[PDB]
Amino acid sequence: QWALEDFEIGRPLGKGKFGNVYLAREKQSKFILALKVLFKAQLEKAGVEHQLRREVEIQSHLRHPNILRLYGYFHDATRVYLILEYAPLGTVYRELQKLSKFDEQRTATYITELANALSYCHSKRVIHRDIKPENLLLGSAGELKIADFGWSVHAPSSRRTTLAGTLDYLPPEMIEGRMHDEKVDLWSLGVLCYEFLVGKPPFEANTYQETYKRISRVEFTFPDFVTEGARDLISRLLKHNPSQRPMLREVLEHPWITANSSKPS
Ligand SMILES: Nc1ncnc2c1ncn2[C@@H]1O[C@H](COP(=O)(O)OP(=O)(O)O)[C@@H](O)[C@H]1O
Ligand SMILES: FC(F)(F)c1cnc(N2CCCNCC2)c(Cl)c1
Ligand SMILES: [Mg+2]
Ligand SMILES: [Mg+2]
């Protein structure tokens, strides 16, 4: 169906491990979109074709306003091209580097938008497993959108792929290679809530080996400026035991969320 020839390419939007993402406009319709470019050689040397297919499968079929759309794909012997919804206000990552810390209202609104999208996902037993600021994008009204379903699967699951980069958002069961479920995304939600308020993730460390130690032991402390209600939500989400983590509904109905979020469930 589609091919490269159908598109005028524009400025580089961002870069990932395999992904190189470009602004693009579709010649006949003038539709603006984002083109994610993957190199087949890199994909094969890493053996992550199954991830690519899972990404295309899962994300093309989901439909939620806080989830980034995927319209289609094509290839051309060197590369694979995913055709995505363009997010005009960039990443949450970028926004956090601009402001250093988010206030409480900004944080709770992001958490609500996140919890809504994740609840939709979990209702299909889809778990994302790679929730972090580089993979959260912003729509034209500033609304949060989850993206990059490269690592998503159906629960329950084990991990058959090597953990490549940062450990900062992964729960103890994932880094210890154990079996896991939905509750992994709840842990990541706690990590995110903390990093939104403090400006760095709660188990951050200088080396891999040490980050690993801080996560399996759940060693984190709060700065003075973190309020009691934020502390309560975060302490509930960062439980070593998955079953002790709240349901998403309890996150959306938590007093601190309801008092600070400007969007509803
Ligand atoms: N739809 C999009 N709109 C705007 N920027 C994007 C979009 N998709 C990706 N980007 C930018 O490119 C980066 C890499 O995209 P991603 O899909 O996460 O690739 P990877 O799977 O390699 O991490 C993102 O972190 C973001 O900065
Ligand atoms: F170039 C793209 F990305 F493939 C593309 C082209 N036309 C599109 N539209 C027509 C179909 C219904 N949606 C409204 C616009 C879309 Cl959504 C994507
Ligand atoms: Mg990514
Ligand atoms: Mg990926």
Compute the distance from residue 254 Cα to the ligand 3 centre, in Å.
29
Among 128, 129, 130, CA closest to 120: 128
**Ligand 1 close to Cβ of residue 34 (< 6 A):** yes
103 annotated as ligand-binding: no
- Judge whether 114 and 172 are in contact, CB under 8 Å: no
Q: Do the two domains 2-90 and 91-261 of this chain adopt the same fold?
A: no
Residue 257: CB atoms within 10 A of its CB come to: 22
Determine phi and psi for 216, rounding to 5 degrees.
Answer: -65, -25
Q: Name the closest ligand to CA 137.
A: 1
Compute the distance from residue 148 Cα to the ligand 3 centre, in Å.
5
How many whole angstroms from its chain centre is CA 40? Answer: 24
Does the domain at 2-90 match CATH 3.30.200.20? Answer given as: yes
Distance, CA of 179 to CA of 172 (rounded, Å): 11
Q: Whose CA is nearest to atom 9 of ligand 2?
A: 31
Q: Whose CA is nearest to atom 1 of ligand 2?
A: 26
Query: Which atom, in ligand 2's list, is nearest to the CA of 6?
Result: 1
- Spell out the domain ranges in the chain: 2-90, 91-261
Q: 124 is written with which tokens? A: 């299909």
Compute the distance from residue 45 Cα to the ligand 2 centre, in Å.
33
91-261: which CATH topology? Transferase(Phosphotransferase); domain 1 (1.10.510)
Distance, CA of 118 to CA of 67 (rounded, Å): 9
Ligand 2 pocket by Cβ (under 6 Å): 26, 29, 31, 33, 71-72, 83
Active site residue: 6, 130, 181, 232, which one? 130
172-175 long-range contacts, CB within 8 A, separation 24+: 172/215, 172/216, 172/218, 172/240, 173/242, 174/129, 175/212, 175/215, 175/216
Distance, CA of 189 to CA of 152 (rounded, Å): 15
Method: X-ray
In 88-201, beta strands by DSSP E: 126-127, 136-138, 144-146, 153-154
The reply to whether 130 belongs to the active site is yes
Distance, CA of 67 to CA of 55 (rounded, Å): 13
Q: How far is CA 21 from CA 36, 38, 45, 64, in A?
A: 4, 9, 20, 22
Compute the distance from residue 109 Cα to the ligand 1 centre, in Å.
22
- Dihedral sign (CA 86, 145, 133, 182): negative
Q: 75 is written with which tokens? A: 């290839």
